[PDB]
Symmetry: D2
Subunit: 482 residues, 4 copies
């Protein structure tokens, strides 16, 4: 078989589907997944084409973080022609994929100085290093915003050509473009990848059918590693992916207005963040919470909804307070256990993975699609994706000391972002008493691996049985690679 099966109907599966179908007109490409898109990250996304907006001091302090950032900057260059190529298969009445061209990053004091001040400086430095067009602007010159004065920004940064897409219109344009290129949509889920003699044979679907293929591309979001891990040896050779459960909302604004740009903060405690993405027709998207969950979750918590709404109404626009809630959206960011994506080939011939993209898979989609298609055609794809090969020992991108400093800072940031009001001795007391328990957990989990802060907090507050199972997992991975 020269047949291709793409497992997954999010932005990544559809993007790779479109690129395969367009580049290999001679081959059958079939894409699996259902219109419900259960736990789907893409439909819950605003979405920001986040490159410079996603910069943190912590990410850029590591070689792996600098490599991930370079790929985000490369992906941004592909978006204008990618959108042109997808809108080309449609008409005016399909709507516009692009909802804003530019982003304003706001700096307010509703957060930790150790995150927000460090991250604002890191964004400014990254923009200058990349020769990207940008301007620090007067807050008074920021269009539309009407914050609570006690929650207001005092600095603002205009990022030119860093925009947003309507994630729903993007998915519709990708499906339309996939069909135009001769792709076939089969609305079932893969249950099992079939392989023997180190080669893919095809996919068993959840209706009990078997589909043969020479190539299987796994882009099933947070389910991607669980699907591949069933193959021989791969349980401790493919890094685990967890559910980065994210809550967002669609709001009909009081007057039908919206901002001309994305409005956002830098990434905040445990990779949450505040942003507003413009939409057509008097709607705005507000996001977005983040919680790594050891099992998937398909509903928003009360706490997530209150935090998102409170941040947006105070820090962006008080008019949102009186605005109508249209939809609370929940999706799972694929959260890799070592903090880096799983992109490329396996020890199994014709088996490819595109997953573990967490906050910025949608942004990276055109670059990731082209990378995997290049590899499938015997090329080397995009330089600097090599470290993010899916079959690997867990990456250790930071020292245990760096992660322990980070997890305590992020824990304290949950207070400052609330924002809390406490006696002034309490924060220093909590900082001192948080250090020991996180140090003890990190030392107990493994002699070699340290989970990033976002996962470490989830493990700290999980059941003893869940902690013990992860100790076993890390020990089995060490055994496999050392």
């Amino acid at each position: 078989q020269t047949d291709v099966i793409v497992v997954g109907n999010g932005v990544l599966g559809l993007s790779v589907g479109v690129e395969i179908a367009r580049t290999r007109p001679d081959v059958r490409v079939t894409l699996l997944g259902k219109p419900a898109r259960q736990y789907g990250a893409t439909p819950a996304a605003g979405a920001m084409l986040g490159a410079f907006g996603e910069v943190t001091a912590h990410a850029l302090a590591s070689e792996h973080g600098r490599k991930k950032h370079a790929l985000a900057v490369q992906a941004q260059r592909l978006w204008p022609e990618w959108i042109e190529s997808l809108e080309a298969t449609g008409t005016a009445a399909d709507g516009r994929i692009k909802t804003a061209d530019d982003t304003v990053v706001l700096l307010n004091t509703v957060g930790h100085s150790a995150l927000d001040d460090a991250n604002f400086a890191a964004v400014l430095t990254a923009l200058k290093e990349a020769n990207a067009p940008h301007e620090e602007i007067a807050v008074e010159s920021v269009d539309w915003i009407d914050p609570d004065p006690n929650s207001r920004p005092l600095r603002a940064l205009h990022i030119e050509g860093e925009g947003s897409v309507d994630s729903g219109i993007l998915l519709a344009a990708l499906e339309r473009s996939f069909l135009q290129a001769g792709g076939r949509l089969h609305p079932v889920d893969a249950t099992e990848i079939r392989a023997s003699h180190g080669r893919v044979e095809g996919v068993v679907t959840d209706d009990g059918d078997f589909l043969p293929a020479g190539h299987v591309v796994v882009a099933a979001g947070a389910r991607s590693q669980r699907l591949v891990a069933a193959l021989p040896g791969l349980a401790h050779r493919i890094p685990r992916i967890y559910d980065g459960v994210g809550v967002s909302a669609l709001v009909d604004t009081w007057d039908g207005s919206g901002p001309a740009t994305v409005l956002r903060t830098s990434n905040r405690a445990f990779a949450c963040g505040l942003h507003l993405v413009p939409r057509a027709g008097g709607s705005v998207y507000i996001g977005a919470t983040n919680a790594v969950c050891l099992e998937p979750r398909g509903a928003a918590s009360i706490e997530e909804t209150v935090f998102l709404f409170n941040c947006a109404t105070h820090q962006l626009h008080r008019g949102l307070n009186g605005s109508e809630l249209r939809k609370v959206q929940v999706g799972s960011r694929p959260a890799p256990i070592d903090g880096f994506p799983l992109i490329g080939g396996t020890s199994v011939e014709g088996l490819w993975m595109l997953s573990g993209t967490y906050r910025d898979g949608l942004h990276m989609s055109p670059l990731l699609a082209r990378h995997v298609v290049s590899l499938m055609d015997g090329g080397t794809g995009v330089d600097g994706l090599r470290e993010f090969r899916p079959e690997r020992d867990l990456i250790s991108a930071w020292s245990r000391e760096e992660i322990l400093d980070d997890v305590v800072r992020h824990t304290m940031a949950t207070g400052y972002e609330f924002p809390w009001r406490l006696p002034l001795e309490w924060p220093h007391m909590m900082e001192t008493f948080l250090q020991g328990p996180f140090a003890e957990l990190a030392d107990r989990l493994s002699d070699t691996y340290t989970p990033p802060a976002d996962l470490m907090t989830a493990i700290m507050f999980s059941e003893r049985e869940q902690q013990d199972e992860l100790i076993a997992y890390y020990a089995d991975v060490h055994r496999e690679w050392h």
Copy 2:
């Protein structure tokens, strides 16, 4: 007989007519969407003593409404038996709790919460109702923020709750079993000539003939009848008391054994948790009088409801899964009292304007209207709440002006705000003049209750002017 409306009141009267007049054809109108429907957004509490306020019981009309709530409570056990009888085990149980605990905390105005707790205690003793003031430590399940915790608690025996969804299903099933016909269209127009109902034009363009039309269309009820000659200024207006509630799957699948509630709070909102089967709880409920209907929750309503429940009832709700935000319109009568009974048009009846407690009163109200339709006198104390009336003036302008300022201040204390200590007295002083000026400008004789007065204060000048005209036309009609 045509019943217009498929909420608790329309279906309850439909069931009572169908069961009592097997010789007559009874058709009930309304759609499964139940647009703006109050009943499906209700918990619901069978609220009698829990609904007591000092302000309500200070007026004759308020004391009359309370007496009817106490009477209605006695009908519920046999009413539920009669509705469950038409179903099987798999249909679920209408009753979700037998008892209520009222909590007193300091996340509110002393001028409402302290006065209302005393009024509830007095009303229970006056009625010889079974109840006990209990230690807060003895209230099962609750886990409040210590800064938001109750310091007093009141156990009300035999004041419980129903699943409003299971009630609606049981009413529809019981209606069909009694030979009622469900026609899933809306009435557009009531047809009448020579002072008699002819029937109803539906929104599919059809005409249904009838000798009797019962209007139970919730917040749409007066707008529907007001098109008939002279009735525009003879049937009190009904507005949308937009209410937000939520269904939450609890973190551990647990729930309280009783209703948990505060007394009624600023502008007839209030905090309660109603138990549900299957690891779900109902939390409610906000209230905002809107001059035009609204079918979606505001961000502000969702945050206030969630913040109150997580702090004052159970911090575990914070980590619990949001299943559904519900929005419905409490039918809010302009004079603060229900519209129940006959009209100057033969065969035209109304059951509406029940605001917070139509669902609780439903079996009593249904039996009252059915008695009237059969030539009886129904229930003694409902006469004052006849739908064709001059607007009731249940309070002095002075009482309402004191109340609207107190309720305005209570929106601060219920938040709860943190302000410099001179600000509250400053705001109290500067609120008095503008509300006095509005009340004096609206009418020489009528004063809207606080819940509506705040909505009018913050409405457009054109909406205020239209109400000035309405009140003047009502005065002209009745005086």
Copy 3:
């Protein structure tokens, strides 16, 4: 026969008055300066606190129940004691008594684990004692005008539990002491002189030597440091630390004041909120408490803000616009083992009256009469024997009880602020506080556990101060076992 009383607070002056009145055979000299450096008494309201001072934690220990019984006994002495002190003065000297009754308020600006438990404990103690009291409607509490979000929802009227003006009390004690033939010598003791196991007298800070057959040490928080210089007494007299307390005198906006004491139960680390009536359009508001390992004679910013914020929200918003006349600071003598030091020593003629913490002023007439009885060869008051100053440290609670208490009191500092936090934070803080306090308690000593008020001070002290206390506890164990 010469007697020297070292200290010019309520306890020194009360014992001075009782000796001078009772012992025509003795010349009695009282030392101490009008500045009353670190003086607890002048910073006190003061409440005649017996039932108001009840906590669940105090009454859960035998030692705590014994201390409470003595407070109830002391209350009965006050009417005749005041009569006897005012008798030596005229109308123009003012009235010692400022209120007859107390209202205890319960609000939610605090930890349920302290305030709810303590309100129940006060109610139980009143009923057990058959003391006159009534739970009253909050609406019936005169004068108060709280923030609605800080308001009480329960109130308790305690009949015959009142207050005195601490300044007028001190003036009446000095005047009564002089009338009875006592001599006031306004210098400080630097050294107690003893040889052949007997007191010889006192070296004063002007370099003089005063001979005496009897020396009574009532020098507040300085009492143990003064006696500890004598042979072996460093590990035989329990340490007394400074329970630094801040209070204020406020001239009310309209010159009004409440007719009763207004108070909460005792709150985090033995602080609490109260208003004590004063004459002439003044009110006393108090009072903060922080155990300090070294003395401190000035209020911190944090103490002033906390006291003022509590009083303006929980008692009367009118205090916000009222004039601040005086911020007062004094040291409650805080015994390391949580119980007073009252009676005789292994040194003939050496006596101690100290370590009374929150309620030495209330207990003063009873404590004074006890020590004077002992000095005259009597047995004084039954059940004050257990509080003899020369003792092994008392262990009135298990390590487990104290560790539960210190975490609860730590959390209460948050709820009393009151803080506003994400709802998961309190449980997180409770979990992460347990280990560090357990580790400290285990490191300090195998046998002794400091009470919560001192344990928090030690937790946040320098490593050198912690190490010195480890050595102290080890030297005490060595001396007594």
Copy 4:
């Protein structure tokens, strides 16, 4: 007589006393006032040598405000030689008048955007227009400060050569310098100025004595107009001066440290503000509240102490929380009813006034002293100070509309500076309901005069009898000058 009596022993009386004594060695100069300095502004001052730091958008929007600012810049140039001349009369052990050379202005969000953002921009503009040395600096580069992250600054401005003096050391140096120049200190208060045939005869003192003089200089702070108003016709010809009651504190810092510069915000609601002025010997000065009172007050309110302490501990240094309170200080800023100082001569020969300087008489003192001494010697003194002659119709420096906008903004700023936490609809509700009552008060007080916002709020919350007496005062002033 050619004798001079200076009435008042604050910075202005002593500064003019020193200048008279030094310039007229042939004349007897006697200075009245007691060491208690009842209601004294000077001893309660930090004090900042505030020129650019005192800039507000509102002040610089009026001609009179721009004139006052020019005089502050001129006064700054005199301080170095003035201090040299005062320290010259002392020895090393008397200590140093100057406590800092430079100022950092901080911008945080614990206040109204309508004051703090507008005022920060106005300070920056005034510095650039004056070609004054200054730099916008990174907040991370501000030494010493340790704010609550939720109360932290996000912008900071370093003003070179704008410093501070120890007000206590200044007063001691002025008294010593006055004696060195042949001045006599008489520690009694003036009760009555004696004048007949349009000429001063001298002063009756509160010990019942009479002191003859050819010249009487009234520099009695907030008591200055009440003292002169007893003379014929002067009740409606000398603008009233009220008590701008100000609370400040001396704190011994936890570690004996202090900042190297003044730390301040711009002027905030009703001319209060937050600042820390360095002192020698492990002490810092924190200030300062401001409340116009229609009668003098010599004690801090609970509210004033809490607000000052809460602002300093959160916005400047959390270490102040655990620091020892040494002294709460209270003084009366002389608050002129028309918002401008009273400096120069009267219709009574030999009668002079130096008062109504509100926030910046201490800073202006060397310039004001030299101006009045020039006038007494038949000169014209300093060009722009003629407009602030004490015998005048009330100045109307702003429209009624401007003042009504200002009073509502300042009222709302008392909320944001607290900072309050309120439902988001409440601020707009309060703004709407404040407008009518202030408009009604302004219209009722006078057809021609409008009190500035600081006084208008005091009048709004005064007794009906106090409002009626001011209506009569304004009517009598109109009658006198029209």
